[PDB]
Amino acid sequence: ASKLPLVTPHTQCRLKLLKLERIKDYLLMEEEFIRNQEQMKPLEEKQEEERSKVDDLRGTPMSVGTLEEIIDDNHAIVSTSVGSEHYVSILSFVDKDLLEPGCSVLLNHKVHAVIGVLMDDTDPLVTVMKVEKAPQETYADIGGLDNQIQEIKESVELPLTHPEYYEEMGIKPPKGVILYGPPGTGKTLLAKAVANQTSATFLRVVGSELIQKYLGDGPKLVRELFRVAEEHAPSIVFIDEIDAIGTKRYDSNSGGEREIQRTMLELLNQLDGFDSRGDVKVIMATNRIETLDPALIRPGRIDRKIEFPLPDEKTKKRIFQIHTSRMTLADDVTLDDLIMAKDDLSGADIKAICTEAGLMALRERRMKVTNEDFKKSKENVLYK
């Protein structure tokens, strides 16, 4: 267990031979300094005897207490489950460390003395906001964009996978990444492929669900949110639809727009605090880029500004080829007629027409999709 970090060599080197034989020196010499213990003074077993001596100190009614302060000479004021706090002492099997104000501990039943500490079952909110597995396919699913893919790999993936290029340059990666354009252009769809690609811990939050009904619970949720973001390791925080905090007013929020404002002050801190931030990357997306505070859009808080245009028609046919890949396409259809149906169709429009056309095939129990399925499919999807 963390015995010797020299695992370099990577061939038949004698260093590897003599170093492993010198671990054989510390282990053969001192396995002959392991024999003599119970040979000279048995007197107990020490594998369970002293262990059951601790376990006979501590009683079976193990009350669970809570720390609020520490005085160093193994006594402190701890909180009971009732609320009536005591001034008990602290044992020697308490490994005086994992002790923070607010920590769950183990107390005596009789004199309530600090027996042990307790591992924390955390909070469900971390599992709620934490993405567990890879969502979907890779960047090859996207198609047609091919320019800002280098931008997102540039700001996010390449700093993670290659920590050499910035050091030979003497430079740091850009901090904030923002994504904006028309709706349905694949803004979240890119973050899907990012969540495929990365090995870092990934968090995702919608900008609508920031707002609350109580006072300050918003900014408190921000503070514990970036707490959770920092307390892991390398992490990626994704924010979707952050214009919605400024556009829609809801009557659940007791404070008006000058509570949303203070939430924006707390978040505005949490992007560029004086504190040591750490390895937390920020990726954001919206469609109303013009509405929110430019103080959050300044370089230093968001460095990279990425626009998504509408798909041009030669990229459209690629997206048709993507969403019509694994389907039994009857040769009746011509995709070029489907291209210029809408002059500004999104990538979601293509997939919607494809899926609804498959629904029209499954109404008639067929296996292939014909041309009239698309003819009435664009009427169903587009025109209403």
Partner 1 sequence: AHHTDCTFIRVSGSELVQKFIGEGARMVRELFVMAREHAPSIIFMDE
Partner 2 sequence: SRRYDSRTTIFSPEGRLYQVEYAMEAIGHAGTCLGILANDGVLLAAERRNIHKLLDEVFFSEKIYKLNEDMACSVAGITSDANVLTNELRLIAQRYLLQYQEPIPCEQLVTALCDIKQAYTQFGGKRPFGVSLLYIGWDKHYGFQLYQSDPSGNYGGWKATCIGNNSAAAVSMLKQDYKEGEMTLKSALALAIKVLNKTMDVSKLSAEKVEIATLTRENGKTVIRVLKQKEVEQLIKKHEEEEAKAEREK
The residue within the footprint of ligand ATP, chosen from 91, 117, 143, 238 (CB under 6 A), is 143
Q: Decide: is 207 part of the binding site for ligand ATP (CB under 6 A).
A: no
The percent helix, strand, coil of the chain (3-state, each to 5) is 40, 15, 50
Q: By C-beta, is 240 or 373 nearer to Mg ion?
A: 240
Write out the binding residues for ligand ATP, residues 289-348 only, by CB under 6 A. Answer: 311, 319, 322, 347-348
User: Is 192:135 a contact under the CB 8 Å cutoff?
Assistant: yes
| Among partner 2, Mg ion, partner 1, none, residue 129 binds (CB under 5-8 Å by kind) | partner 1
Write out the binding residues for partner 1, residues 207-236 only, by CB under 8 A. Answer: 209, 212, 217, 221
Q: Decide: is 234 part of the binding site for ligand ATP (CB under 6 A).
A: no
**Which tokens in the block code for residue 147?**
């320019």
Q: Decide: is 183 part of the binding site for ligand ATP (CB under 6 A).
A: yes
Instruction: State the number of CA atoms in the 13 A half-sphere of 97 facing the CB.
Output: 2
Q: What DSSP element (H or E) covers 189? A: helix 187-197
63: left (phi over 0), alpha (psi -120 to 50) or beta: beta
| Among ligand ATP, partner 1, Mg ion, none, residue 186 binds (CB under 5-8 Å by kind) | ligand ATP
Task: For residues 99 and 118, give the distance between their C-alpha atoms in angstroms, rounded to a whole number.
Answer: 10
Binding-site positions read 181-188
**DSSP 3-state assignment of 243?**
coil
Q: By C-beta, is 239 or 260 nearer to ligand ATP?
A: 239
Q: By C-beta, is 130 or 153 nearer to partner 1?
A: 130
Residue 125: name the closest of 213, 231, 46 by CA. 231
User: Is 104:63 a contact under the CB 8 Å cutoff?
Assistant: no
Q: What is the separation, in whole angstroms, between the first and last Cα of the chain? A: 67
User: Is 336:317 a contact under the CB 8 Å cutoff?
Assistant: yes
**Which tokens in the block code for residue 312?**
């041009």
Write out the binding residues for partner 1, residues 118-147 only, by CB under 8 A. Answer: 124-125, 128-129
Write out the binding residues for ligand ATP, residues 52-81 only, by CB under 6 A. Answer: none
* Nearest-approach distance from CB 225 to Mg ion, in angstroms: 21
Q: By C-beta, is 45 or 313 nearer to partner 2?
A: 313
Q: Decide: is 188 part of the binding site for Mg ion (CB under 5 A).
A: yes
Residue 156: name the closest of 196, 119, 208 by CA. 196
Q: By C-beta, is 18 or 125 nearer to partner 1?
A: 125
Q: Report CA torsion sign: 283, 286, 289, 294.
A: negative
Task: For residues 81 and 65, give the distance between their C-alpha atoms in angstroms, rounded to a whole number.
Answer: 6
* Nearest-approach distance from CB 382 to partner 2, in angstroms: 8
Binding-site positions for ATP read 181-188
**DSSP 3-state assignment of 274?**
coil
Question: Which residue of this chain has its Cβ atom nearest to Mg ion in the complex?
Answer: 188
User: Could you tell me which residues are beta bridge partners of residue 57?
Assistant: none
Q: By C-beta, is 305 or 351 nearer to ligand ATP?
A: 351
- For the chain, what's the residue count? 384
Q: Decide: is 290 part of the binding site for partner 2 (CB under 8 A).
A: yes
Contacts of 199 (CB under 8 A, 6+ apart): 160
Task: For residues 83 and 70, give the distance between their C-alpha atoms in angstroms, rounded to a whole number.
Answer: 17
- Report CA dihedral (206, 181, 284, 268) to the nearest 10 degrees: -100
Write out the binding residues for partner 2, residues 315-344 only, by CB under 8 A. Answer: 341
Stretch that binds partner 2, among 20-28, 200-208, 303-311, 376-384 (CB under 8 A): 376-384
| Among partner 1, Mg ion, ligand ATP, none, residue 287 binds (CB under 5-8 Å by kind) | ligand ATP
* Nearest-approach distance from CB 211 to ligand ATP, in angstroms: 17
Stretch that binds partner 2, among 42-50, 266-274, 295-303, 375-383 (CB under 8 A): 375-383
Q: By C-beta, is 1 or 128 nearer to partner 1?
A: 128
Q: Decide: is 38 part of the binding site for partner 2 (CB under 8 A).
A: no
* Nearest-approach distance from CB 145 to ligand ATP, in angstroms: 6
- Residue numbers at the binding site for partner 2 (CB under 8 A): 290, 341, 378-379, 382-383
- Residue numbers at the binding site for Mg ion (CB under 5 A): 188
- Residue numbers at the binding site for partner 1 (CB under 8 A): 124-125, 128-129, 209, 212, 217, 221
